[PDB]
């Protein structure tokens, strides 16, 4: 139950991330004590062609 | 529901109850300039001012021009009346335009502030007691008080009809003045002269024979 | 134009405005401006030798500018 709801839209707060200040869909949130449990999928790929990434609880905000 | 094009899809922004309350609503907006309600309200005020100004100007051009055709008056053409009037005048056109700009700017600024805030011109102790009469009615662009001295706007039964007679006529006047300009650049004579020339021979005196409106023919 | 009178008057005037008019403002601005030698003087208002040199320099520049302009005859 920790973290954002699955399927919701969040804004990335990681400064070095390609999707900084961008909206992405929440895929899954790990229930353990991992550093980056939130899984976010994006519509636009980065320079490496990846569309998903892992972020911490404080690195994503419900937007 | 009267429409400007039977069968055409009327825009959704012109079908709302607020937009349908405007006079002369025929669903005519192909460019979609009135999609924004604030923009629609501003354009409604602009259309009302244009209607009244065009009606006054077209009347001042047509009635003296029609009386000049007969022996009632001797008013010159509208495109030449400015020079004739400024010749035997007490002031040059620049000084007159400056005084006009100041006098018009005062009332236009008051109307602008009323558009931004309806009824805001009724601030007590601001216009020597005349501010009580400067508050418009519930409809923007339709004030009472000093305006409308006959009180013909108090009767609601004819109110909706009266507005329909003001916008439509105004729209016609807006086109009339436009024609007055185009004809001046296509025939070189006044509107009454063009009307008489066309009535004398309509099958040969029209815009298809002036050599300007149809450059490919 | 007497050069001595003009120079003496300009220097005395600048020293007077620096000792009785702008001394408090200068002291307030110098303290708020934040190895050294303390030029302590017996002047009751703290007007030291450095202030004398600065105000005298300004007075001399003003006096020589006035003398120069008057010498140009215009």
């Amino acid at each position: 139950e920790v973290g954002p709801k699955r399927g919701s839209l969040v804004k990335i707060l990681r400064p070095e991330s390609y999707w900084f200040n961008q909206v992405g869909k929440v895929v899954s949130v790990d229930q353990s004590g991992v550093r980056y449990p939130v899984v976010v999928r994006f519509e636009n790929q980065n320079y490496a062609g990846v569309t998903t990434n892992n972020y911490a609880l404080d690195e994503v905000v419900a937007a | 529901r009267q429409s400007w094009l039977p069968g055409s899809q009327i825009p959704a922004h012109l079908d709302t109850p607020a937009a349908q309350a405007l006079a002369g609503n025929f669903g005519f907006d192909p460019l979609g300039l009135g999609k924004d309600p604030v923009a629609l309200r501003w354009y409604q005020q602009a259309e009302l001012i244009h209607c009244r100004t065009a009606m006054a100007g077209v009347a001042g051009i047509l009635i003296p021009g029609l009386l000049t055709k007969a022996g009632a008056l001797n008013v010159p053409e509208w495109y030449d009346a400015g020079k004739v009037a400024i010749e035997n005048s007490f002031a040059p056109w620049g000084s007159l335009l400056a005084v006009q700009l100041f006098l018009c700017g005062f009332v236009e600024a008051k109307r602008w502030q009323d558009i931004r805030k309806p009824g805001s011109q009724g601030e007590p102790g601001s216009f020597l007691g005349f501010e009580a009469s400067l508050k418009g009615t519930s409809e923007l662009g339709y004030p009472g008080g000093p305006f409308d001295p006959l009180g013909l706007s108090k009767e609601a039964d004819k109110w909706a009809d009266w507005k329909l007679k003001e916008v439509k006529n105004g729209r016609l006047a807006m086109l009339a003045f436009l024609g007055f300009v185009a004809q001046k650049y296509a025939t070189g004579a006044g509107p009454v002269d063009n009307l008489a020339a066309h009535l004398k021979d309509p099958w040969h005196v029209n815009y298809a024979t002036n050599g300007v409106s149809l450059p490919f023919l | 134009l007497d050069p001595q009178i003009v120079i003496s008057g300009s220097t005395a005037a600048f020293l007077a405005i620096g000792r009785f008019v702008f001394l408090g403002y200068q002291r307030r601005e110098a303290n708020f401006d934040s190895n050294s030698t303390i030029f302590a003087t017996n002047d009751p208002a703290g007007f030291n030798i450095i202030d004398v040199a600065g105000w005298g320099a300004l007075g001399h520049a003003v006096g020589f500018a006035v003398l120069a302009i008057n010498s140009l005859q215009g």
């Binding site: - | 000084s95 502030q113 009323d114 805001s120 011109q121 601030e123 601001s126 | 134009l1 300009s10 008019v21």
Partner: protein
Amino acid sequence: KAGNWLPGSDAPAWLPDDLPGNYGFDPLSLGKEPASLKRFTESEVIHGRWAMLGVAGSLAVELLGYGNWYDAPLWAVNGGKATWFGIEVPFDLNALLAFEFVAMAAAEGQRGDAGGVVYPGGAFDPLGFAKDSSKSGELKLKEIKNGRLAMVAFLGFVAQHAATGKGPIAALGEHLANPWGANFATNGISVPFF
């Protein structure tokens, strides 16, 4: 408040009600900061007083008959002597700059050292017309209104002179002789397309 500069418009929240001459006129929001507004108040009062004295002097010289305000310093540029009220002044331009510089430096230095005092009182008010602060609010409004009017008048003096070459009294008489034919719209300088 003294009134409303725009009837029907909301007054700015940064303008206090007890401030004299508060008409709510601040479209550019220059006095939004409280520190800037404090300096602007004394600056406006000082400007109004200086403009009142300047306009009064400019009108007095032309009314009495000693030229206009623009032709007054013309004696110091090409072999002349200053004449106050028709009496020859025994001071040249070199002595005037020293006296004025020292006097103004001392007076303005004391005023600056005071700490932004707008209404000193005491020695500056020997008649005691503002001894009580209750009635001083109405008298301050008259001072700020006359100051703003005098500032506008001095700006008009400079503009009308730069556009025509005549003094304020001479321009007034010309306008009275021909209002429609002699104004800012007929000088050929203000509006270039008229």
